[PDB]
Amino acid sequence: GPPSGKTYMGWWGHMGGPKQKGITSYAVSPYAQKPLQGIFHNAVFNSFRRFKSQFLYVLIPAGIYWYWWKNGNEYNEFLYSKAGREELERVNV
Amino acid sequence: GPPSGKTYMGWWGHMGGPKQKGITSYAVSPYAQKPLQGIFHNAVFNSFRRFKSQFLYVLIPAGIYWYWWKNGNEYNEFLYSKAGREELERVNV
Amino acid sequence: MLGICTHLGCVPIGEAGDFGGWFCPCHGSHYDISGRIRKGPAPLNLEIPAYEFDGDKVIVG
Amino acid sequence: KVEVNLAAIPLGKNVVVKWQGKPVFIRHRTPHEIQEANSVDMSALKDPQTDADRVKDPQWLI
Amino acid sequence: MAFRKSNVYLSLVNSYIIDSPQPSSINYWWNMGSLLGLCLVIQIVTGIFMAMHYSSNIELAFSSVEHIMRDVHNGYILRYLHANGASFFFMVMFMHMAKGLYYGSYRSPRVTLWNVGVIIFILTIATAFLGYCCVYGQMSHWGATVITNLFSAIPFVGNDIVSWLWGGFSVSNPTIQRFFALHYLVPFIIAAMVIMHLMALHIHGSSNPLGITGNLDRIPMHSYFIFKDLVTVFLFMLILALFVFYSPNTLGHPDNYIPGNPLVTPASIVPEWYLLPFYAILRSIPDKLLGVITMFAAILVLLVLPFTDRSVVRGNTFKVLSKFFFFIFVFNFVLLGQIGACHVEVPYVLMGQIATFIYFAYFLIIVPVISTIENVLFYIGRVNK
Amino acid sequence: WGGFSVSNPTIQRFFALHYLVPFIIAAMVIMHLMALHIHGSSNPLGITGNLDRIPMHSYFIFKDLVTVFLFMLILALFVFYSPNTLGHPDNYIPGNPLVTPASIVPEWYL
Amino acid sequence: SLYKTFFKRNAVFVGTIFAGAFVFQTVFDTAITSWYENHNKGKLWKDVKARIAA
Amino acid sequence: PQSFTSIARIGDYILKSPVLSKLCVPVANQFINLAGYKKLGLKFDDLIAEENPIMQTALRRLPEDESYARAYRIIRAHQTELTHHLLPRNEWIKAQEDVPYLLPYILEAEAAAKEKDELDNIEVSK
Amino acid sequence: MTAAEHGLHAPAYAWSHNGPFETFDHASIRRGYQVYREVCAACHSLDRVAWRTLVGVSHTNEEVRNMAEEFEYDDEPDEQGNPKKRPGKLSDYIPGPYPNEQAARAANQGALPPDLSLIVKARHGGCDYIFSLLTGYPDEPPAGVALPPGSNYNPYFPGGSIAMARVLFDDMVEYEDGTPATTSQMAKDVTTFLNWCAEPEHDERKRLGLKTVIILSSLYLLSIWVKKFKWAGIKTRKFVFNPPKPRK
Amino acid sequence: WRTLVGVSHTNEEVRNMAEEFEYDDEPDEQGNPKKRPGKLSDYIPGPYPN
């Protein structure tokens, strides 16, 4: 077939990034190291570190919307009691 | 993606035939010529010429198989008449 | 009279009411005999079919 | 199993049931009547078989 | 070369499954697309084995489903898997979409991939709606009545559209027999859109959680990300089995075990949990025509996001203000579902109105204003004079 | 069968499978076209065609309209003027397990 | 050693994958059924049927 | 997206103004520290999305020595993130090193694209 | 809505079949069917339960064949086209008292009693609501509520007024196994029988789910092991940079 | 019955042919069966019941 409109990604050998010079990589085989090595020093170090960072962005929103659902559910149950029948006929009109 | 195993047909510019040299082609626009120009001198010249060539390859087989269906259908109707009840009880056993 | 409460789809009960007409236990959807809401929060009284008269005929259609 | 029982279908009665959605024929007997069946020899016919192989207690047929 | 690279058909498997270059840093949020493909296989296979025993006539329909439960060998497994499998399919899709919204996957060069996805979502709400009606209990009849009567408000043409949708003058036998034949069809159209969705991913490949290029460090798919995907397949099949075998009717309504009756209205007509936020948006608009427009506009406002994000950085990983308002929008989407399961009473009327506004203001007013503020703060913090 | 004879469970399962298999044929038609694109089409002489090629649009698109309209014409002539000549009359008798026909015959193409 | 008889081979590997699969199912079935029927002793129909002995 | 020409126009106005700079700069500094891209060993211009023609042009015009270092910072950050750790605090980018090394190449390519485009849609007098 | 129009919340009783490893108590099912036959069946149908499904669950084969033969069923017409009757067989379904809806409303002052084959699954609360309903009729209605003539008060029904009157009382049934037939005892056995009518796969389902959850739980742990082994090269790989000379 | 109108007979003719036959009505207020004459939406009846 014909070639189509090209991309921002290539394939192995011509992936399409910048030319690299002066970087060296080292590695060791997995058969030569011991797995399940430190996964405490992981759930107690890193999970608690990752939690402590990204928890005020999730919980301050959650606290505003849950308080809102509360004060509404509390007020509704008052409207349909017998002590809140006068208010019901005021607000429902 | 990667290139796959190649073919015996390419695309425009690299179709994959032999190199040509010394052949010239000429043509005229269809707007400058008249259509429906000779289509008798076609159905009477060329169709009859094409028929006359390839008709003994189709009709000698057709004549052998149709004769065969005939002699069978003729013989069956004789078997189930009253003049062919003696033969029926011979061949059906 | 057709009983398609527009905002309910509810079914007023005969043999009950305040005026010998209608009551539904739906919202307190009281109607009058002719069939006009009276004490229930439903917005309008409902559709009377385009039935005509032709003699041994009422073409409820 | 649409299994009928014994005192149902009488003398002049050969009823076709839908047992297992199958066209099944049930008939009634009288003890004189399997000599009835093997009145013949077998070389007239295809496969030699006998009353004792037909139906177990042949005086009610299925 | 290798056979897997030369053969016409295996070359496509190799380029998509085996040798595909993937960024080294993608996390487990990138595993949801695999699960949605197993989900579609579960539903199509379980549904074809039930269709062998189902009858679509309105007088035979409810009793055919009870016949699958009692008389068919392992038929209670097929239905509960199928019914709870649709609840799981929708939950994995909401998480797949929320991810792309967080990491900026909608942005150029992947605008075409986001748009084919919005189509899959619309066709998937339609499928589930048509199938719930085929049970023909009491939530099935009155749910189809409420939604199909919405199209009678279109000017001058509406009462012709409802009678052509019904096949008559009400939800009746012709309605239930046509909804089953269409419900079998649309899953095969979703599958054809999933192939077009994958073609648009192969061009530029996948993004990564940092929002920068991934062409400097790539890992092949086979035996790093194939075995990373088994981890989440077995967790999905465990939690699903726990619902099918130990709590198989908690994600449903009891009224749909009552057979459908046009003459008795239920006290509360409520959709399944995954259509409740859109059901609250509809009920919030007093007018009938504007309500049905605002509900469909809630699905197609997602197409406006590639032009309203005004930032030079992709994704939210390094963005403080844009993280806070991402999680405002998520919990506002959970309140809309709750309000959609309530009675129309004070104060749940005004709550759903204010929350319908916040759904639309996020895409159209909040994102443009915070993106511009964040750009200028990056500049004056580094370039200060 | 789903039982002991051709019965109700047989007819309900044969309809659900009959809806399915057309969508499997369509997926095999796409794989069929992929295998044609590699080498393209042959020609009536049995030699290479890489020395003289014509594009598809406006030579072979308009050549294909010729046979589309002849196909629709002959089909319309059967649907509207002779719609039961390629069938058997016995299939207008409802199905009965207890009466066998005198001649059990398939359609002409099997 | 062990490697050349159990693991190295790829016919009595994929072989003994299915060999144990057929044997695992039957012992696993018998074991779970026995634990379930014993945990619910006195409520089953077999025990009741023996207890209504009149 | 927004142009760097427009980003610089707004920023320079804020910075030249004394009252606005005393009011908007501390907010911007702590927006930078809370983001946390220095802790992975990146400068801000590493984060700019590069799949567009103005940005592809700026990266070709970049010197070789600055381009080799950019590639290493990006590889080091991907590896730091798949392990779910941070770098040592003695390898964090400092404030004096977080310089806009690529901005002049961007503003030059943008100004040329606007001049070319105006010239292709000109209204001529007679 | 007010709490009356909603109904009173049913409590949580300690049913013997609640739990992931529990089965139905089959002696309570057997006793429950006796309460159905002698109290409920006068005005309620059980149309979706066949005779054969009781064999091996609450009654013996010989017992069920004798219960079915006490009812007459429509046979197919005779040799001249006139209708016939026959006794029941195992493949038949349990018959109801009335022939149509009009006769049912006529015998119950306009109200229609529902079929009970799926009533446990078709009500919020399940077995706790069915039990609390039957045992919830007070002596007097609370002072102020005006009931119509022909309606009865109990607070578990939405609205407060129900067309059914109390039907259970002490020692109206004599059990074959010598159990004291108090009001609560019969109510418990009735609800247990009715839950089996709605969910006849309950006992098989809960043991196939023990097999499936054990197998899938170990595959999930094995998959975590295998992943972390095949990923150990990438996680500990190291990089070094030496700035080259910019000659190039 | 209705398919004969406009083909072989007039509307008034077909209404009178159908009313000469009795059809099963739905049961009365006490559940007993009723009968009624024919209408245009009914089908032409046969001589035998089985």
Ligand SMILES: CCCCCCCCCCCCCCCCCC(=O)OC[C@H](COP(=O)(O)OCCN)OC(=O)CCCCCCCCCCCCC
């Ligand atoms: C037309 C219809 C369209 C509308 C669709 C609306 C979608 C709403 C659906 C809600 C789906 C659930 C939320 C999914 C959130 C995905 C977010 C994500 O991709 O992960 C973000 C974050 C990753 O953190 P970072 O990559 O920044 O790394 C940290 C620093 N290195 O990791 C996190 O912080 C995730 C923390 C988990 C948040 C939990 C909140 C879930 C809310 C519950 C919803 C269901 C309740 C019933």
Ligand code: HEM
């Ligand atoms: C995307 C795929 C599908 C989805 C999301 C889907 C959804 C649903 C849903 C929500 C129901 C109602 C569940 C309930 O009983 O409460 C249902 C019912 C049903 N569906 Fe599907 N469906 C899908 C594919 C199919 C297919 C391909 C078929 C047929 C081949 C099918 C056949 C049926 C049948 C027969 C029912 C009857 C009720 C039942 O058995 O539960 N479904 N479907």
Ligand code: HEM
């Ligand atoms: C049947 C439904 C779907 C299937 C089977 C499916 C499949 C996939 C798969 C396999 C991927 C690969 C990368 C990944 O898993 O993130 C993907 C990516 C993606 N999908 Fe879907 N998808 C579906 C629905 C959707 C929907 C509803 C949307 C958005 C409305 C969507 C938008 C995207 C985007 C933007 C990406 C690229 C994300 C990135 O590279 O960062 N898809 N999809």
Ligand code: HEM
């Ligand atoms: C039933 C749906 C089928 C469709 C839609 C289809 C479609 C096509 C089309 C469009 C072509 C190219 C034009 C042509 O050569 O006429 C083609 C070629 C061909 N087809 Fe099919 N086909 C179908 C079935 C079959 C079958 C049943 C066979 C053989 C058993 C077959 C074998 C071939 C071959 C060998 C060619 C190449 C002929 C040549 O290039 O000389 N196809 N098909």
Ligand code: HEM
């Ligand atoms: C142990 C004996 C019985 C049981 C367990 C039983 C079961 C039930 C149940 C579960 C309901 C639930 C309807 C609901 O609240 O939504 C009901 C309603 C009803 N029952 Fe019974 N039943 C019994 C005996 C009877 C008898 C003997 C009669 C008639 C004499 C009767 C007449 C009715 C009526 C008329 C209703 C309709 C209530 C209404 O719609 O207001 N019941 N029954």
Ligand SMILES: COc1c(O)c(C)c(C/C=C(/C)CC/C=C(\C)CC/C=C(/C)CC/C=C(/C)CC/C=C(\C)CCC=C(C)C)c(O)c1OC
């Ligand atoms: C990032 O890159 C990725 C990537 O990460 C992943 C995970 C995948 C794999 C993920 C996918 C979602 C692709 C999987 C494909 C689908 C979901 C499409 C499924 C299409 C269908 C038509 C499914 C239908 C299935 C059937 C079995 C139909 C036949 C029915 C039968 C046999 C039952 C009835 C039969 C009888 C006899 C009763 C990629 O392809 C990919 O691209 C490079």
Ligand SMILES: CCCCCCCCCCCCCCC(=O)OCCCOP(=O)(O)OC[C@@H](O)COP(=O)(O)OCCCOC(C)=O
């Ligand atoms: C102007 C005149 C017009 C008049 C005529 C009107 C006709 C109009 C319609 C023309 C017909 C459509 C054209 C044909 C076509 O596009 O498809 C046929 C060719 C084969 O399809 P394909 O796209 O190569 O396969 C599709 C493939 O190329 C893509 O593969 P993918 O699915 O992305 O891989 C996923 C597989 C991963 O494997 C798994 C699932 O594990």
Ligand SMILES: CCCCCCCCCCCCCCC(=O)O[C@H](COC(=O)CCCCCCCCCCCC)COP(=O)(O)O
């Ligand atoms: C496609 C997108 C990814 C989604 C997850 C894919 C899940 C399905 C594929 C399963 C992985 C198979 C690859 C194994 C392989 O070829 O390497 C084989 C391993 O095969 C073996 O001998 C061990 C048995 C394989 C374990 C199978 C685990 C679960 C199987 C499916 C579970 C049901 C879904 C080794 O050869 P290789 O290293 O060259 O690849």
Ligand SMILES: CCCCCCCCCCCCCCCCCC(=O)O[C@H](COC(=O)CCCCCC)COP(=O)(O)OCCN
């Ligand atoms: C996107 C939708 C449709 C496209 C689907 C693509 C993905 C489908 C996966 C197909 C699985 C692999 C199928 C068979 C692979 C081997 C084919 C082969 O060996 O080619 C032929 C054998 O011919 C056949 O019988 C084809 C049967 C097709 C089976 C239909 C399922 C011999 O191999 P061949 O020499 O052509 O390969 C060229 C590389 N040298």
Ligand SMILES: COC(=O)N(OC)c1ccccc1COc1ccn(-c2ccc(Cl)cc2)n1
């Ligand atoms: C799963 O089925 C149900 O929950 N259904 O349908 C029987 C139900 C049941 C009770 C009450 C309401 C509904 C319907 O609620 C909704 C809300 C939006 N849609 C919708 C439908 C089609 C399209 Cl294209 C777009 C939007 N439907």
Ligand SMILES: COC(=O)N(OC)c1ccccc1COc1ccn(-c2ccc(Cl)cc2)n1
């Ligand atoms: C169009 O339908 C008919 O003509 N049918 O079928 C009701 C018919 C009707 C009357 C008599 C015989 C038949 C069947 O004749 C045949 C002959 C071969 N196949 C066959 C079927 C399936 C497969 Cl996989 C392979 C071969 N069927």
